[PDB]
Design a protein around this ligand. Sequence first.
Ligand SMILES: CC1=C(CCC(=O)O)c2cc3nc(cc4[nH]c(cc5[nH]c(cc1n2)c(C)c5CCC(=O)O)c(CCC(=O)O)c4C)C(CCC(=O)O)=C3C
Ligand SMILES: [Cl-]
Ligand SMILES: [Fe+3]
Ligand SMILES: [Fe+3]
Length: 308
Amino acid sequence: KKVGLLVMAYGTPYKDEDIERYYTDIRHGHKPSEEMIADLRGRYHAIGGLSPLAKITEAQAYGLEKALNDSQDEVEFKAYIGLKHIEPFIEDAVEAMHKDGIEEAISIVLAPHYSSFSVEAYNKRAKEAADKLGGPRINAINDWYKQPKFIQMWADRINETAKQIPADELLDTVLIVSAHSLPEKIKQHNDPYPNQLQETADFIFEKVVVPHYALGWQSEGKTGEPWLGPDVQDLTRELYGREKYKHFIYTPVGFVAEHLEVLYDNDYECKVVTDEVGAAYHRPPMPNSDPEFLEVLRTVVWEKYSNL
Ligand SMILES: CC1=C(CCC(=O)O)c2cc3nc(cc4[nH]c(cc5[nH]c(cc1n2)c(C)c5CCC(=O)O)c(CCC(=O)O)c4C)C(CCC(=O)O)=C3C
Ligand SMILES: [Cl-]
Ligand SMILES: [Fe+3]
Ligand SMILES: [Fe+3]
Protein backbone atom coordinates (compact mmCIF):
# COMPACT_ATOMS: atom_id res chain seq x y z
CA LYS A 1 0.00 0.00 0.00
CA LYS A 2 1.70 3.17 1.29
CA VAL A 3 5.21 3.52 2.70
CA GLY A 4 6.43 6.81 4.12
CA LEU A 5 9.60 8.36 2.70
CA LEU A 6 11.27 10.29 5.53
CA VAL A 7 13.71 12.64 3.78
CA MET A 8 15.81 14.50 6.34
CA ALA A 9 18.15 17.47 5.98
CA TYR A 10 19.79 20.23 8.01
CA GLY A 11 17.31 23.01 7.23
CA THR A 12 17.82 26.68 6.45
CA PRO A 13 16.15 29.91 7.62
CA TYR A 14 13.21 30.78 5.38
CA LYS A 15 13.38 34.49 6.25
CA ASP A 16 16.09 36.80 7.55
CA GLU A 17 14.14 36.99 10.83
CA ASP A 18 14.63 33.22 11.27
CA ILE A 19 18.43 33.39 11.60
CA GLU A 20 18.39 33.91 15.38
CA ARG A 21 16.20 30.92 16.25
CA TYR A 22 17.97 28.84 13.58
CA TYR A 23 21.39 29.55 15.10
CA THR A 24 19.93 28.93 18.57
CA ASP A 25 18.63 25.49 17.55
CA ILE A 26 22.01 24.67 15.99
CA ARG A 27 23.74 25.75 19.21
CA HIS A 28 21.75 23.19 21.24
CA GLY A 29 19.38 25.90 22.47
CA HIS A 30 22.12 28.26 23.69
CA LYS A 31 21.39 31.63 22.11
CA PRO A 32 24.45 33.02 20.29
CA SER A 33 25.80 36.49 20.91
CA GLU A 34 25.03 39.41 18.62
CA GLU A 35 28.58 39.15 17.26
CA MET A 36 27.99 35.53 16.23
CA ILE A 37 24.56 36.41 14.82
CA ALA A 38 26.07 39.29 12.82
CA ASP A 39 28.82 37.13 11.32
CA LEU A 40 26.32 34.48 10.21
CA ARG A 41 23.93 37.14 8.87
CA GLY A 42 26.82 38.66 6.93
CA ARG A 43 27.63 35.32 5.30
CA TYR A 44 24.01 34.94 4.19
CA HIS A 45 24.05 38.46 2.75
CA ALA A 46 27.38 37.70 1.08
CA ILE A 47 25.81 34.86 -0.92
CA GLY A 48 22.85 37.04 -1.88
CA GLY A 49 20.64 37.21 1.22
CA LEU A 50 19.39 33.69 1.88
CA SER A 51 20.19 30.13 0.87
CA PRO A 52 18.18 28.20 -1.75
CA LEU A 53 18.51 25.10 0.42
CA ALA A 54 14.82 25.06 1.38
CA LYS A 55 13.63 25.01 -2.24
CA ILE A 56 16.27 22.51 -3.37
CA THR A 57 15.51 20.18 -0.45
CA GLU A 58 11.82 20.25 -1.42
CA ALA A 59 12.63 19.50 -5.06
CA GLN A 60 14.89 16.62 -4.02
CA ALA A 61 12.34 15.15 -1.60
CA TYR A 62 9.36 15.38 -3.95
CA GLY A 63 11.50 14.60 -6.98
CA LEU A 64 12.51 11.38 -5.22
CA GLU A 65 8.85 10.57 -4.49
CA LYS A 66 7.87 10.96 -8.15
CA ALA A 67 10.98 9.05 -9.25
CA LEU A 68 10.13 6.11 -6.99
CA ASN A 69 6.41 6.07 -7.82
CA ASP A 70 6.90 6.26 -11.60
CA SER A 71 9.44 3.40 -11.71
CA GLN A 72 7.35 0.64 -10.11
CA ASP A 73 3.87 -0.32 -8.92
CA GLU A 74 4.72 -2.48 -5.92
CA VAL A 75 4.30 0.25 -3.29
CA GLU A 76 3.23 3.89 -3.16
CA PHE A 77 5.84 6.16 -1.58
CA LYS A 78 4.82 9.33 0.27
CA ALA A 79 7.60 11.80 1.03
CA TYR A 80 7.71 13.67 4.35
CA ILE A 81 10.37 16.33 4.90
CA GLY A 82 11.99 16.37 8.33
CA LEU A 83 14.54 19.08 9.06
CA LYS A 84 17.15 19.06 11.80
CA HIS A 85 17.17 22.68 12.99
CA ILE A 86 13.97 24.36 11.71
CA GLU A 87 10.37 23.48 10.96
CA PRO A 88 9.18 21.09 9.67
CA PHE A 89 11.38 19.31 12.22
CA ILE A 90 12.21 15.61 12.17
CA GLU A 91 9.59 15.18 14.89
CA ASP A 92 6.98 17.05 12.84
CA ALA A 93 7.51 14.71 9.89
CA VAL A 94 7.10 11.59 12.04
CA GLU A 95 4.01 13.18 13.61
CA ALA A 96 2.55 13.78 10.15
CA MET A 97 3.30 10.18 9.13
CA HIS A 98 1.60 8.69 12.20
CA LYS A 99 -1.37 11.03 11.77
CA ASP A 100 -1.67 10.09 8.09
CA GLY A 101 -1.83 6.41 9.07
CA ILE A 102 1.63 5.49 7.77
CA GLU A 103 2.65 2.20 9.39
CA GLU A 104 6.04 1.67 7.71
CA ALA A 105 8.60 4.25 6.63
CA ILE A 106 12.05 4.39 5.06
CA SER A 107 14.28 7.25 6.18
CA ILE A 108 17.19 8.76 4.25
CA VAL A 109 19.48 11.69 5.06
CA LEU A 110 20.44 14.14 2.31
CA ALA A 111 24.13 13.46 3.03
CA PRO A 112 25.77 10.30 1.64
CA HIS A 113 28.13 9.72 4.59
CA TYR A 114 27.39 8.53 8.12
CA SER A 115 28.64 10.00 11.38
CA SER A 116 27.71 10.03 15.05
CA PHE A 117 27.19 13.81 14.83
CA SER A 118 25.18 13.79 11.58
CA VAL A 119 23.16 10.76 10.40
CA GLU A 120 23.09 9.13 13.84
CA ALA A 121 21.44 12.25 15.28
CA TYR A 122 18.90 12.26 12.43
CA ASN A 123 18.01 8.62 13.05
CA LYS A 124 18.01 8.94 16.85
CA ARG A 125 15.48 11.78 16.88
CA ALA A 126 13.35 10.00 14.27
CA LYS A 127 13.32 6.62 16.03
CA GLU A 128 12.54 8.17 19.42
CA ALA A 129 9.76 10.33 17.96
CA ALA A 130 8.08 7.24 16.49
CA ASP A 131 8.55 5.38 19.78
CA LYS A 132 6.70 8.07 21.75
CA LEU A 133 3.92 8.08 19.15
CA GLY A 134 3.68 4.32 18.56
CA GLY A 135 4.54 4.55 14.86
CA PRO A 136 5.54 4.37 12.10
CA ARG A 137 8.29 1.74 12.01
CA ILE A 138 11.30 3.64 10.66
CA ASN A 139 13.85 1.66 8.64
CA ALA A 140 16.87 3.95 8.50
CA ILE A 141 19.42 4.25 5.71
CA ASN A 142 22.74 5.15 7.34
CA ASP A 143 24.83 5.97 4.26
CA TRP A 144 24.79 5.58 0.49
CA TYR A 145 28.08 7.02 -0.84
CA LYS A 146 28.97 3.54 -2.14
CA GLN A 147 26.14 3.71 -4.68
CA PRO A 148 27.88 3.49 -8.09
CA LYS A 149 25.53 6.03 -9.67
CA PHE A 150 26.53 8.50 -6.94
CA ILE A 151 30.24 7.97 -7.60
CA GLN A 152 29.68 8.21 -11.36
CA MET A 153 27.57 11.37 -11.05
CA TRP A 154 30.47 13.17 -9.38
CA ALA A 155 33.06 11.79 -11.81
CA ASP A 156 30.99 13.00 -14.78
CA ARG A 157 30.75 16.51 -13.29
CA ILE A 158 34.51 16.62 -12.69
CA ASN A 159 35.34 15.27 -16.15
CA GLU A 160 32.99 17.82 -17.73
CA THR A 161 34.93 20.58 -15.96
CA ALA A 162 38.39 19.13 -16.63
CA LYS A 163 37.74 19.13 -20.38
CA GLN A 164 37.54 22.94 -20.31
CA ILE A 165 41.07 23.00 -18.85
CA PRO A 166 43.87 23.06 -21.46
CA ALA A 167 45.68 19.75 -21.88
CA ASP A 168 49.08 21.29 -21.09
CA GLU A 169 47.61 22.41 -17.74
CA LEU A 170 45.70 19.25 -16.77
CA LEU A 171 48.91 17.87 -15.26
CA ASP A 172 48.85 20.88 -12.90
CA THR A 173 45.20 20.31 -11.92
CA VAL A 174 44.19 18.92 -8.52
CA LEU A 175 40.80 17.76 -7.24
CA ILE A 176 39.88 18.76 -3.68
CA VAL A 177 37.29 16.37 -2.23
CA SER A 178 35.77 17.66 1.00
CA ALA A 179 32.84 17.54 3.40
CA HIS A 180 31.69 19.26 6.57
CA SER A 181 34.36 19.00 9.24
CA LEU A 182 33.66 17.41 12.61
CA PRO A 183 35.47 17.40 15.97
CA GLU A 184 38.62 15.32 15.61
CA LYS A 185 37.68 13.23 18.67
CA ILE A 186 35.50 11.02 16.44
CA LYS A 187 38.68 9.49 15.01
CA GLN A 188 39.58 8.20 18.48
CA HIS A 189 36.52 5.92 18.39
CA ASN A 190 36.83 4.82 14.73
CA ASP A 191 33.87 6.83 13.50
CA PRO A 192 33.34 5.81 9.84
CA TYR A 193 32.97 9.44 8.65
CA PRO A 194 36.64 10.19 7.74
CA ASN A 195 37.20 6.74 6.23
CA GLN A 196 33.95 6.96 4.25
CA LEU A 197 35.06 10.23 2.68
CA GLN A 198 38.53 8.92 1.86
CA GLU A 199 36.80 6.01 0.11
CA THR A 200 34.57 8.45 -1.79
CA ALA A 201 37.58 10.43 -2.99
CA ASP A 202 39.41 7.22 -3.94
CA PHE A 203 36.40 5.94 -5.90
CA ILE A 204 35.91 9.24 -7.74
CA PHE A 205 39.62 9.70 -8.46
CA GLU A 206 39.87 6.39 -10.32
CA LYS A 207 37.13 7.57 -12.72
CA VAL A 208 38.29 11.11 -13.58
CA VAL A 209 41.02 12.42 -15.89
CA VAL A 210 42.34 14.76 -13.16
CA PRO A 211 45.79 13.37 -12.23
CA HIS A 212 45.94 14.81 -8.69
CA TYR A 213 43.58 14.80 -5.73
CA ALA A 214 43.50 15.54 -2.01
CA LEU A 215 40.96 15.14 0.80
CA GLY A 216 40.01 18.13 2.94
CA TRP A 217 37.36 19.43 5.32
CA GLN A 218 35.45 22.68 5.66
CA SER A 219 33.04 24.73 7.77
CA GLU A 220 34.61 23.77 11.10
CA GLY A 221 32.70 25.14 14.06
CA LYS A 222 33.28 27.84 16.66
CA THR A 223 34.53 25.64 19.50
CA GLY A 224 37.68 25.10 21.55
CA GLU A 225 38.47 21.55 20.38
CA PRO A 226 40.45 20.38 17.33
CA TRP A 227 38.40 19.59 14.24
CA LEU A 228 39.05 17.28 11.30
CA GLY A 229 41.77 18.75 9.12
CA PRO A 230 43.19 19.88 6.84
CA ASP A 231 40.82 22.77 6.06
CA VAL A 232 40.24 23.26 2.34
CA GLN A 233 41.66 26.79 2.55
CA ASP A 234 44.79 25.63 4.38
CA LEU A 235 45.09 22.62 2.07
CA THR A 236 44.94 24.89 -0.98
CA ARG A 237 47.85 26.97 0.34
CA GLU A 238 49.95 23.91 1.16
CA LEU A 239 49.29 22.26 -2.20
CA TYR A 240 50.23 25.40 -4.15
CA GLY A 241 53.36 25.95 -2.06
CA ARG A 242 54.50 22.38 -2.71
CA GLU A 243 53.21 21.66 -6.23
CA LYS A 244 52.28 25.05 -7.76
CA TYR A 245 48.96 23.76 -9.08
CA LYS A 246 47.30 25.90 -11.75
CA HIS A 247 43.72 24.65 -11.33
CA PHE A 248 41.81 23.70 -8.17
CA ILE A 249 38.58 21.71 -8.58
CA TYR A 250 36.50 21.62 -5.39
CA THR A 251 33.87 18.89 -4.99
CA PRO A 252 32.38 18.99 -1.47
CA VAL A 253 30.83 15.56 -1.95
CA GLY A 254 29.60 15.56 1.65
CA PHE A 255 26.90 18.00 0.52
CA VAL A 256 24.18 17.49 -2.08
CA ALA A 257 23.01 21.06 -2.72
CA GLU A 258 24.22 24.63 -3.22
CA HIS A 259 23.80 26.11 0.26
CA LEU A 260 25.73 28.44 2.56
CA GLU A 261 28.54 25.95 3.23
CA VAL A 262 29.14 25.78 -0.54
CA LEU A 263 28.20 29.26 -1.77
CA TYR A 264 30.40 30.87 0.91
CA ASP A 265 32.92 28.37 2.30
CA ASN A 266 33.82 27.27 -1.25
CA ASP A 267 32.71 29.89 -3.78
CA TYR A 268 34.13 32.75 -1.67
CA GLU A 269 36.64 31.51 0.92
CA CYS A 270 38.38 29.00 -1.37
CA LYS A 271 38.28 31.38 -4.34
CA VAL A 272 40.04 34.00 -2.19
CA VAL A 273 42.92 31.55 -1.69
CA THR A 274 43.19 30.63 -5.37
CA ASP A 275 43.05 34.33 -6.27
CA GLU A 276 45.87 34.91 -3.77
CA VAL A 277 48.20 32.22 -5.14
CA GLY A 278 47.15 33.05 -8.70
CA ALA A 279 45.42 29.76 -9.57
CA ALA A 280 42.09 29.15 -11.26
CA TYR A 281 38.99 28.24 -9.25
CA HIS A 282 36.59 25.46 -10.27
CA ARG A 283 33.51 24.21 -8.40
CA PRO A 284 31.32 21.83 -10.44
CA PRO A 285 27.54 22.12 -9.97
CA MET A 286 26.11 20.56 -6.83
CA PRO A 287 23.73 17.60 -7.32
CA ASN A 288 20.65 19.71 -6.38
CA SER A 289 17.55 18.08 -7.97
CA ASP A 290 19.19 16.96 -11.21
CA PRO A 291 17.54 13.88 -12.78
CA GLU A 292 20.82 11.97 -12.46
CA PHE A 293 20.86 12.63 -8.71
CA LEU A 294 17.17 11.78 -8.34
CA GLU A 295 18.09 8.49 -10.03
CA VAL A 296 20.83 8.02 -7.42
CA LEU A 297 18.38 8.42 -4.55
CA ARG A 298 15.71 6.37 -6.33
CA THR A 299 18.13 3.45 -6.63
CA VAL A 300 19.21 3.83 -2.99
CA VAL A 301 15.69 3.88 -1.54
CA TRP A 302 14.44 1.07 -3.77
CA GLU A 303 17.45 -1.03 -2.77
CA LYS A 304 16.49 -0.50 0.87
CA TYR A 305 12.82 -1.42 0.39
CA SER A 306 13.73 -4.60 -1.49
CA ASN A 307 16.02 -5.67 1.36
CA LEU A 308 13.31 -5.42 4.04
C1 LIG B 1 28.03 17.20 9.61
C2 LIG B 1 27.34 18.48 9.22
C3 LIG B 1 26.66 18.72 8.03
C4 LIG B 1 26.47 17.76 6.89
C5 LIG B 1 25.31 16.78 7.07
C6 LIG B 1 23.91 17.40 7.06
O1 LIG B 1 23.53 17.96 6.01
O2 LIG B 1 23.22 17.31 8.10
C7 LIG B 1 26.17 20.07 8.10
C8 LIG B 1 25.42 20.77 7.14
C9 LIG B 1 24.97 22.08 7.19
N1 LIG B 1 25.27 22.97 8.18
C10 LIG B 1 24.60 24.12 7.86
C11 LIG B 1 24.68 25.29 8.57
C12 LIG B 1 25.35 25.54 9.76
N2 LIG B 1 26.02 24.60 10.50
C13 LIG B 1 26.58 25.17 11.62
C14 LIG B 1 27.31 24.49 12.59
C15 LIG B 1 27.64 23.16 12.61
N3 LIG B 1 27.35 22.27 11.61
C16 LIG B 1 27.86 21.07 12.03
C17 LIG B 1 27.83 19.89 11.29
C18 LIG B 1 27.28 19.67 10.03
N4 LIG B 1 26.57 20.61 9.31
C19 LIG B 1 28.43 21.19 13.38
C20 LIG B 1 29.03 20.07 14.18
C21 LIG B 1 28.31 22.50 13.73
C22 LIG B 1 28.74 23.14 15.01
C23 LIG B 1 27.64 23.18 16.06
C24 LIG B 1 28.08 23.83 17.35
O3 LIG B 1 29.25 24.26 17.42
O4 LIG B 1 27.25 23.89 18.28
C25 LIG B 1 26.25 26.56 11.58
C26 LIG B 1 26.66 27.58 12.61
C27 LIG B 1 27.91 28.38 12.27
C28 LIG B 1 29.18 27.57 12.02
O5 LIG B 1 29.21 26.81 11.02
O6 LIG B 1 30.13 27.72 12.81
C29 LIG B 1 25.51 26.79 10.45
C30 LIG B 1 24.94 28.11 10.00
C31 LIG B 1 23.77 23.92 6.67
C32 LIG B 1 22.80 24.91 6.10
C33 LIG B 1 23.44 26.02 5.31
C34 LIG B 1 22.39 26.98 4.77
O7 LIG B 1 21.64 27.55 5.59
O8 LIG B 1 22.33 27.14 3.54
C35 LIG B 1 24.08 22.68 6.20
C36 LIG B 1 23.56 22.02 4.96
CL1 LIG C 1 24.18 19.93 14.23
FE1 LIG D 1 26.05 22.65 10.10
FE1 LIG E 1 33.93 29.17 8.62
